[PDB]
Amino acid sequence: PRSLKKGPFIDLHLLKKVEKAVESGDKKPLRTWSRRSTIFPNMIGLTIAVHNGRQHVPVFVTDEMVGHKLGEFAPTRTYRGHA
Amino acid sequence: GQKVHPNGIRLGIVKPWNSTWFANTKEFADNLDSDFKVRQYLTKELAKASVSRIVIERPAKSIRVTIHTARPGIVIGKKGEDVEKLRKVVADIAGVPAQINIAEVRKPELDAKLVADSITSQLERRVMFRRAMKRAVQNAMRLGAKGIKVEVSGRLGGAEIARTEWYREGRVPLHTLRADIDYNTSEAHTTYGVIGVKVWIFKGEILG
Amino acid sequence: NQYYGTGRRKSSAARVFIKPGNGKIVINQRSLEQYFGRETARMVVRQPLELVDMVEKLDLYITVKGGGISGQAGAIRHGITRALMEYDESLRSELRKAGFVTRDARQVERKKVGLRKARRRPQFSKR
Amino acid sequence: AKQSMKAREVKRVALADKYFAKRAELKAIISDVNASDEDRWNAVLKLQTLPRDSSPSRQRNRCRQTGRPHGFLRKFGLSRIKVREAAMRGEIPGLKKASW
Amino acid sequence: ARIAGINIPDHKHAVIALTSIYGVGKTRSKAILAAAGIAEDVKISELSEGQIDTLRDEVAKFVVEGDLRREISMSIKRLMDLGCYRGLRHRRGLPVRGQRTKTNARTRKGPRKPIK
Amino acid sequence: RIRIRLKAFDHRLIDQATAEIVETAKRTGAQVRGPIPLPTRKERFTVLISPHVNKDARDQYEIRTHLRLVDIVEPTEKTVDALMRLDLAAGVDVQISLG
């Protein structure tokens, strides 16, 4: 995990996107390629469709997704089984 | 991949290094980059001149180059002209006050760099390859050579299957470490592919 | 007035001083029993001593460095025999038949390329 | 290697030499423990706007005569093949074959 | 010789026999007896009756046998139902900590299944 | 005391420079402390000699570095300055010092 004297990591653009989302008040799906940004508690109650290498898959952030990262809900491989 | 390069196993024994300079581990690679480019442009410029052994000896913030050659008469040009016209583009690459001196090489038939360049320029102009081998094998023995071996390698005569052929006269030891083995290699760029030349010349055994 | 010896082993080298006295023993400023914890290593420094009659004639003073338990103990042995001869020149014939005046020059063989050790080649399998 | 892999390398040395004292300042604002989180929130969002090729841990060592990204040696700058060729001629002072 | 809602063995020593509790190891049991004031090489049998009393007041502050089996089962089932990467690996029997699953995944998958 | 180190890759050209640097101030000065040798770094290497796939076929190289020491205890007026104008051969960096 990232150090705690450094603090959390987030992109500067997605922080401006979610702020502009809540201040305007939309439920539009925000598509962002920031799987490496940690979710902030203002992002709760929004649809933020984080990319998985192939497309954009939506994430509606509930409470328990704060200290996680956005890539954990956008699966990047695909697998059904061998036979 | 069977034979060692005969120069490298002789470098501490009877043969010198071409670059005798000091550095630390800081600036060793920057000097080594510096030494490669100044030999690279001196090859392209003096490819009509008979330069054989460029020696980069750089003591105390200046570079010195002894050009070993069969003729200074094109390497100097006019007396003090091409020694100076090449120097100002030698002090461009290195970054030190350059000094391109000259030591002349007599007897051009006894040089493995020049025999590599006197066979390749005949292979370049479509001669019969087996004649061009035999001039070098016979000319060294008149000039007092204890042994020669030449070899052309790869797509001889134009035919589709490549091969390799060689000749030998006198004696050329290789396992004797104290053998005065002159040895170098050239590159023939013909219309059907690449031909390679190797030449061994033995003079004697430099006693210790 | 003193007598000196030199001995060597694998990576060991000892400095043996000899004075006449009680038969007093000092090994790196320390006693015979304090230094060598191993009884076999306590023995092998006394191997020329039981060979000849000099367990009481001479004192022996040791400063050994480098090597190991049996390394330094074989370094001290070859040096005492060098000093048994540095005194007498007569005991050389019994010490030669003991094999004590010969430095056993078995040095450690280096690791080589394509090998896991000095001689252990890796596990070959044809398929 | 490719000409577009040597030229891709050169600007990574150029861009990282330009923004050296500016990327190093934003680390010491976070390497300071005894500073304010009204500054340690300003350093951590500012370093994303600096380019990715500005980081000194982004550029990769290559052989200086061919551009090979493996077999590297730092004392020569070259890969394993080109040190060997220049040794056997003699342009590397001291470098000969060893045996012990 | 009965500590913390289980039975702890009789003829084992002080710090060893406490490690039968789901929730202590060799280190945390040294924290029990150095705080309480008992030597560490006596058994749990022939401890006096004024000694087993206070020893659980050292144990009760830790999150132990029933209090610790539930929060691990609450932790893993919380990873299940969000849809995170970790819980996908907890509901598919494939390991979580980054390890290679091309070969040597023989703990989370069980021993070898033949092809049928 | 005045220190003079010499680092050189050649093993006889540094022996060729010590009867060059003593013979500059032996005339002018006295109590030259002497040509003290130091141990030798043997900086070794290993590469691969095949271009594609032969891991066991290799060459072991090395570069050895030679060290000496020339120590002048007290200079005269004419000791270091005659030594100062001189310049030694290639493959050597000298390190003159005081302290």
Next chain:
Amino acid sequence: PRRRVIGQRKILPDPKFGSELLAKFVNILMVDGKKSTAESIVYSALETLAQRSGKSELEAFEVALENVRPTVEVKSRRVGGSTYQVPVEVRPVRRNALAMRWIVEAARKRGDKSMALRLANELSDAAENKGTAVKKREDVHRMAEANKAFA
């Protein structure tokens, strides 16, 4: 080897008794290079080994070694149809080195709490003609007399 012969190298006597063969049972007992923790099981062997016997410390071992010395062994010539197991008179050194190998072998295989207690339940019985090292002398001497036909 096909060509030539080497003899022997010197084997250092001990600090303890002044024997060549005391160094030769610790070398068969030594595993993984440890002469320190092997020469001390041998020293803690002979203490309880002379105690039950009532003999000298070294002389009690030399009698337990006697009842396990092989005298006829079968080697393989294998020039006929199958392998012929041909019985041979044994040289006096292989009488001793095979015996010490069998006493070290049994003491690995017991279930006591020490090594020296697994060992002293074997060198006690090897002078008392029961155990496992005497089962190996008599299973070699069972194969050596069922092959007495061949010469």
Next chain:
RNA sequence: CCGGCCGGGAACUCAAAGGAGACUGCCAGUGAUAAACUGGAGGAAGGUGGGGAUGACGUCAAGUCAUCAUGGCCCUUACGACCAGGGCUACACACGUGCUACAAUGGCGCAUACAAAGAGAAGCGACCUCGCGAGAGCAAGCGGACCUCAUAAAGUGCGUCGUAGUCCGGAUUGGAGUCUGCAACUCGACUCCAUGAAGUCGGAAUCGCUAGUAAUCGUGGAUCAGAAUGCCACGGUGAAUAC
């Protein structure tokens, strides 16, 4: 100041330049007056002293057009070029090479002896100060036989656990962390704490090794921001056996 640190001393070790020595040369004996071989007086070394490098003519249309170079052909708003995320880390499964184990010749705790070879400037980073710890803070010392990396471990002294899936084994997952790094979800190493799998020496078959070898136990280095059970290098302990 009980510590070569410090008068001083050039002995000894050690360092590294030059000379010395080993040649079946002197001894008997076998053999064709030969070449040679067997045993030996000597000697630090005996008969190729020990290790390395050194790979003849050619074989396999052996390997690499992706280190590089190059005949030919093919591509040219794309088979070229720049970017962000993803992938090279996937897993019903199959084989090759390793590390750790299955314990008492051992585990833990405590005291305590003994090395060699190496690297170091955008580098290694004493002591002091905190922190359960990896680390952090302040910050000397060294371009280095000066300074640091650096504490060798197996061993020995004492003490315990006494044959159980165990005070053996350490996988695996839960919650906390530290660090390098724009950035540790995919997909890093390390710390502390909780959990404590399989495993009790392995069918047929198969491999390495002739002496400082095997076995064993540590240690360095190169690639490198970080990331070695791999690769290369080093010493300590140190066998069995060859009719």
